[PDB]
Design a protein around this nucleic acid. Structure first.
Ligand SMILES: Nc1nc2c(ncn2[C@H]2C[C@H](O)[C@@H](COP(=O)(O)OP(=O)(O)OP(=O)(O)O)O2)c(=O)[nH]1
Ligand SMILES: [Ca+2]
Ligand SMILES: [Ca+2]
Ligand SMILES: [Ca+2]
Length: 344
DNA sequence: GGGGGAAGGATTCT
DNA sequence: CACGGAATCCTTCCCCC
């Protein structure tokens, strides 16, 4: 309004909390949601865990085996994505009743442009307690709210107040963070980028202002360059806009690695059958076969057709692209799947 | 010189 | 890496005005 007022909501340890909601008997105990790859007994990884377990180091990304090694007595539940998704949607609807300007950024977070629903942050903070309280009431889900002048800082405000919290980073505090904040804690800055920036001499957002663009561009790319410089100059003002799915796909892990076409197909087709059920009523013009090689490397191959793709065409083309992969790469394949995009 | 795609890879999401 | 999506961006290549 004078400048945006963004309200960001991020659901606390989502998948695990949902499981808690569906079985409150779990509350207070360490809960670990798992992704069993079927390779052996407990092969796989943790999708997420609640804070009770997270304090002992059990968090998203670690092998289930190491999790059990740390907390052999925690409750281990298999991931139930669809259920979580439906719980997510109902909540997104609640939020949708606090602003038409809503951006569902992921399965458990969203930005709300509340510039014309409040003036000054006090009214914002209160509107956050209002929303937090509302959600807790209707779905018994705790969330963390973040408020600031733009999407990035609202999210940062959230990361700082997790879990079940709420924080406001006023315009004056942004100035402090632009200099105080660790560059790696900036959204979109993963380990790889974090490093490329270290070497360059950037450790705080402020530092991107003292380097020459062209150099910074060649090191982390133009897009990421302008992004950081925007935040640095305190000129980041990306608008909140409704995002719509552009891709739908599934990829499974094989019992054993392989390069034998007939051994891989059953998995590939299974991925297709599920990808299709999920496409719902959407018709894709583009298809990509995706394979994870034995050394966790990802190779893909695809084709865009001038028309929509039928299930039959998907089966036939997928086999061709899979062959193109086996043909152009010697590695064994560990995970195989498909991705459909460019919906009509 | 440069628009517009398409394809395959790189990163991020914490 | 010991899942499993999904978005965006980079580089290269291609057709061609
Ligand atoms: N399979 C899989 N799922 C993930 C992964 N990371 C996150 N998810 C899923 C399950 C998480 O509960 C859900 C929400 O992501 P968040 O980063 O907000 O994690 P959580 O919500 O557990 O984090 P938080 O409470 O905000 O610290 O997305 C991952 O690495 N693998
Ligand atoms: Ca989140
Ligand atoms: Ca969360
Ligand atoms: Ca990071």
């Amino acid at each position: 309004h004078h400048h945006m007022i963004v309200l960001f909501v991020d659901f606390d340890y989502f998948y695990a909390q949902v499981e808690e909601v569906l079985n409150p008997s779990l509350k207070g105990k360490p809960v670990v949601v798992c992704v069993f790859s079927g390779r052996f007994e407990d092969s796989g990884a943790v999708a997420t865990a609640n804070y009770e377990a997270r304090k002992f180091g059990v968090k998203a990304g670690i092998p289930i085996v190491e999790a059990k090694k740390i907390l052999p007595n925690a409750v281990y539940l298999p991931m139930r994505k669809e259920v979580y998704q439906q719980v997510s949607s109902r909540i997104m609807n609640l939020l949708r009743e606090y602003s038409e300007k809503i951006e569902i950024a992921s399965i458990d977070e969203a930005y709300l442009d509340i510039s014309d629903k409040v003036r000054d942050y006090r009214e914002a903070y209160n509107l956050g307690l209002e929303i937090k309280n509302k959600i807790l009431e209707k779905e018994k889900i705790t969330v963390t709210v973040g408020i600031s002048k733009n999407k990035v800082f609202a999210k940062i405000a959230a990361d700082m107040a997790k879990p079940n919290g709420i924080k406001v980073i006023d315009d004056e505090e942004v100035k402090r963070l632009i200099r105080e904040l660790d560059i790696a804690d900036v959204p979109g800055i993963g380990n790889i980028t974090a490093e490329k920036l270290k070497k360059l001499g950037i450790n705080k957002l402020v530092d991107t202002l003292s380097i020459e663009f062209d150099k910074l561009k060649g090191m982390i790319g133009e897009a990421k360059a302008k992004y950081l410089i925007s935040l640095a100059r305190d000129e980041y003002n990306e608008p909140i806009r409704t995002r719509v799915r552009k891709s739908i796909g599934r990829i499974v892990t094989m019992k054993r690695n392989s390069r034998n076409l007939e051994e891989i197909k059953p998995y590939l087709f299974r991925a297709i059958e599920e990808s299709y059920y999920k496409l719902d009523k959407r018709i894709p013009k583009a298809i990509h076969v995706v394979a994870v090689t034995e050394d966790l490397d990802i190779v893909s191959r695809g084709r865009t057709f001038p028309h929509g793709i039928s299930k039959e065409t998907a089966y036939s083309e997928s086999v061709k692209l899979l062959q193109k992969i086996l043909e152009e790469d010697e590695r064994k394949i560990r995970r195989i799947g498909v991705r459909f995009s460019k919906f009509i």
